[PDB]
């Protein structure tokens, strides 16, 4: 079943646009937020849009984007932090700690400019509707 990936910082849902751009909304009605979490191994996930079937990805500069071909840049490490929120790192650029995020306004937040103590990396899986 699908879940939404609500970010605490702004309180937006994680979205992948047909335009392949990765932002964040608040429109519970929006279709491009109804994410589909899938796991390779345990702790490794694939988040794809149940609409444009796009796989959340992060290129070599730490920039979230919607690709249509599931690949190395689509592998994220889902983790439940002590505070009970979820934090997703880039398998690929994991060594540095490039988390998925969003700035207080609902826009992707460059992997490099991000960090552990940030409310931008914390997510919550909420029901469909």
């Amino acid at each position: 079943k699908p879940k939404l990936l609500y970010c605490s910082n702004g309180g937006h849902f994680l979205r992948i646009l047909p335009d392949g751009t990765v932002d964040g909304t608040r429109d519970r009605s929006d279709q491009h937020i109804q994410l589909q979490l899938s796991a390779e191994s345990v702790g490794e996930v694939y988040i794809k849009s149940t609409e444009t079937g796009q796989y959340l990805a992060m290129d070599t500069d730490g920039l979230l984007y919607g690709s249509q071909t599931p690949n190395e840049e689509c592998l994220f490490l889902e983790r439940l932090e002590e505070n009970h929120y979820n934090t997703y790192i880039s398998k690929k650029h994991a060594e540095k700690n490039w988390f998925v995020g969003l700035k207080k306004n609902g826009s992707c937040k460059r992997g490099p400019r991000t960090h552990y103590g940030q409310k931008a990396i914390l997510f919550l899986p909420l029901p469909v509707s």
Binding site: Y6, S8, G10, G11, R26, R28, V42, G43, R79, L80, E81, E82, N83, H84, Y85, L124, L126
Partner: protein
């Protein structure tokens, strides 16, 4: 001439309509209004009056900061909270939606970065550690690379399972150790490497 019906004095602070949080948290809702006479404020849970006694722990209100506050939030609190600012010239209202989520019990959690890798000259005594946070006692086992060296409850105690020792190493001991922990909700696990010198 000096009349004035309620107006918002800080729209950016009301931007976040949906409040989704882990239970036990504290939540604050704000409705910064302006107006003359100074407007009054009241809060509504799902439409009707939100009596203090309507939730364990009650709720605080900070009129000087136009806010409502609920501590140690619980699943029962889920709902719609609406403020209602008013004076004799009119009123304004806003509505926040709160979704509190009970996340425990959950899979065991391993403090990131651990176990820490290591390396030592043949004959030396290396050490490995696995810290696991849990509201219970998690099943934890050490796996060598298949051999399961230690296991919580089996051969080593809990206090003992936290630290995997390896006295008088060798070039054989060179490999990928693993910390596997878990419960009925699931498991977590992190590896480390022992480089023999």
């Amino acid at each position: 001439n000096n009349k004035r019906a309620p107006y918002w004095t800080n729209t950016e602070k009301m931007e976040k309509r949906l409040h989704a949080v882990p239970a036990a948290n504290t939540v604050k809702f704000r409705c910064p209004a302006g107006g003359n006479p100074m407007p009054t404020m009241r809060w509504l849970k799902n439409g009707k009056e939100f009596k203090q006694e309507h939730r364990i722990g009650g709720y605080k209100v900070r009129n000087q900061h136009w806010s409502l506050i609920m501590e140690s939030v619980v699943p029962s609190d889920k709902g719609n909270y609406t403020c209602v600012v008013e004076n004799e010239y009119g009123s304004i209202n806003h509505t926040y939606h709160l979704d509190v989520v009970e996340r425990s019990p959950h899979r065991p959690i391993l403090q990131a970065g651990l176990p820490a890798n290591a390396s030592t000259v043949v004959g030396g005594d290396v050490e490995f550690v696995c810290k696991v946070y849990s509201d219970a006692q998690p099943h934890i086992q050490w796996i060598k690379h298949l051999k399961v060296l230690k296991a919580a409850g089996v051969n080593t105690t809990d206090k003992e399972i936290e630290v995997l020792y390896i006295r008088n190493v060798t070039f054989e001991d060179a490999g990928e150790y693993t910390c596997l922990a878990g419960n009925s909700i699931g498991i977590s696990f992190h590896s480390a490497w022992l480089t023999v010198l």
